Amino acid sequence: HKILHRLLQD
Amino acid sequence: KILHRLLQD
Amino acid sequence: SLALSLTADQMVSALLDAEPPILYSEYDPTRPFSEASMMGLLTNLADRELVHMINWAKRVPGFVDLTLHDQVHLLECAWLEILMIGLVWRSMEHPGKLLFAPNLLLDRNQGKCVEGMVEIFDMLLATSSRFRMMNLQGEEFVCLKSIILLNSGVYTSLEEKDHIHRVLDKITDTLIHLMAKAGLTLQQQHQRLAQLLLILSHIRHMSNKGMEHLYSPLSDLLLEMLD
Amino acid sequence: LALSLTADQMVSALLDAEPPILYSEYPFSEASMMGLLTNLADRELVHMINWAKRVPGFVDLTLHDQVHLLECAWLEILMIGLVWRSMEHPGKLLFAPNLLLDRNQGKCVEGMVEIFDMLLATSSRFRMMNLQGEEFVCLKSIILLNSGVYTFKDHIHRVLDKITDTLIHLMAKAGLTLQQQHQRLAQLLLILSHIRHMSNKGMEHLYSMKCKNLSDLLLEMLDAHR
Ligand SMILES: CCN(c1ccc2ccccc2c1)S(=O)(=O)[C@@H]1C[C@@H]2O[C@H]1C(c1ccc(O)cc1)=C2c1ccc(O)cc1
Ligand SMILES: CCN(c1ccc2ccccc2c1)S(=O)(=O)[C@@H]1C[C@@H]2O[C@H]1C(c1ccc(O)cc1)=C2c1ccc(O)cc1
Structure with a gap:
């Protein structure tokens, strides 16, 4: 639901 | 301009 | 310039003596709030404060x-x-x-x-x-x-x-x-x-965010400030 | 772990974490100018996020x-x-x-x-x-x-x-x-x-060009300021 979430986890 | 006036007094 | 020649203590004294007064609002309890009286209250207050702020600025060293x-x-x-x-x-x-x-x-x-x-x-x-x-x-x-x-x-160039x-x-x-x-x-x-x-x-940030909603019940002095 | 670092270790860590200088796509119009910048900023965001994770304490x-x-x-x-x-x-x-x-x-x-x-x-x-x-x-x-x-x-x-x-x-x-x-x-x-001020005025116009027609990532970065 949040792209920023994904980019931070990756 | 009121500002300029009050600044001049 | 006077300003440059001041010691730290004399700087403080000048600023302290130049402090504007704390003004009162017109708030009448009872009303319970209109919730657009309140903006009138805040606008009237800010408008009166602006007058003192302008005269305060004159007493700020260098201004x-x-x-x-x-x-x-x-x-x-x-x-x-x-x-x-x-x-x-x-x-x-x-x-x-x-x-x-x-x-x-x-x-x-x-x-x-x-x-x-x-x-x-x-x-x-x-x-x-x-x-x-x-x-x-x-x-x-x-x-x-x-x-x-x-x-x-x-x-x-000027340059002040x-x-x-x-x-x-x-x-x-x-x-x-x-x-x-x-x-x-x-x-x-x-x-x-x-x-x-x-x-x-953060104070710049708050001012900016505040200014935005304004550009969307003001005195003539405030209306000028809002260029 | 960030607090235990020395000043030089702090500097070196920050310098090493620096993102790369990206290139844009190869007179301008209103749409083409905004296109090149939007594309560039969107790619920079990806690197910024990886840079952020390398900022000590983050x-x-x-x-x-x-x-x-x-x-x-x-x-x-x-x-x-x-x-x-x-x-x-x-x-x-x-x-x-x-x-x-x-x-x-x-x-x-x-x-x-x-x-x-x-x-x-x-x-x-x-x-x-x-x-x-x-x-x-x-x-x-x-x-x-x-x-x-x-x-x-x-x-x-x-x-x-x-x-x-x-x-x-x-x-x-x-x-x-x-x-x-x-x-x-x-x-x-x-x-x-001043940088905060420029950013505030900047955000203000991005909301006014989403309206009317930015990548979904840029749109989500924007919605947080509205
Ligand atoms: C001044 C702009 N603001 C808003 C925000 C949203 C609004 C929404 C609708 C209408 C006005 C609005 C004003 S705001 O920043 O909250 C602002 C901050 C604080 O409350 C608002 C406000 C204020 C200032 C001037 C006004 O004409 C009205 C309100 C404040 C204030 C007043 C006196 C002070 O000595 C210090 C602060
Ligand atoms: C924030 C977008 N701006 C404007 C300015 C005026 C506008 C006027 C009308 C409509 C939009 C406007 C946008 S602006 O602040 O100049 C902004 C700053 C600079 O150019 C704009 C911009 C930018 C950033 C993201 C975008 O989707 C588009 C533009 C900049 C930028 C881009 C990449 C960088 O690595 C660094 C900066």
């Missing part, structure tokens, strides 16, 4: 060494910031509330009475809490407020821009002088100095 | 807290980066090595010229101060950790203090006196207020 055009510009840019830092300062001893006037102490909930405001309301509260935590001093406060006046519009920078450096020397007197180490002085100036970015 | 925060700070600071960080690499090009803004613009091109978009001049003013200010790269990376880290801290903190504040110690350390190394050290510190930090 009269500038042209009328530059004086107008600095105030146009900084007036809401200056109102805001004054508000959070006198609200320091009132946790969770904002002391707009001695007879107008408001919480978050009475904030909601206007559609935008809570957001700015919460940020003002957080700022006041920050000052309380740092135990901001009155001598430090008047320094910060003067910095806001001189700095907020300095980036909008340099002259302002000299005075700004002087206020920095004054802040350090105050902290060194309070028994702070050099590390602590620098750290506290940084902490204080970083809060100014 | 990994110690919750995901939600990390998200908050980036959402608040991303345009400021893009702007101070733009201003930094525009220093050696007075009167110009180096968006990318193959995208160098003057304020005259800034009018191609209705309202870019106001912020253009502010950005140029900031670059000239940095050039006047002879801003060093070690100072620049400290300021950019400060922006990341400070800009959102009051819209949620003690961990963040102690990291901020450490960067202040680092900034002073750099100035003492450069041979500045005690007076010159706090004076320069104040000067640098006051510029951050």
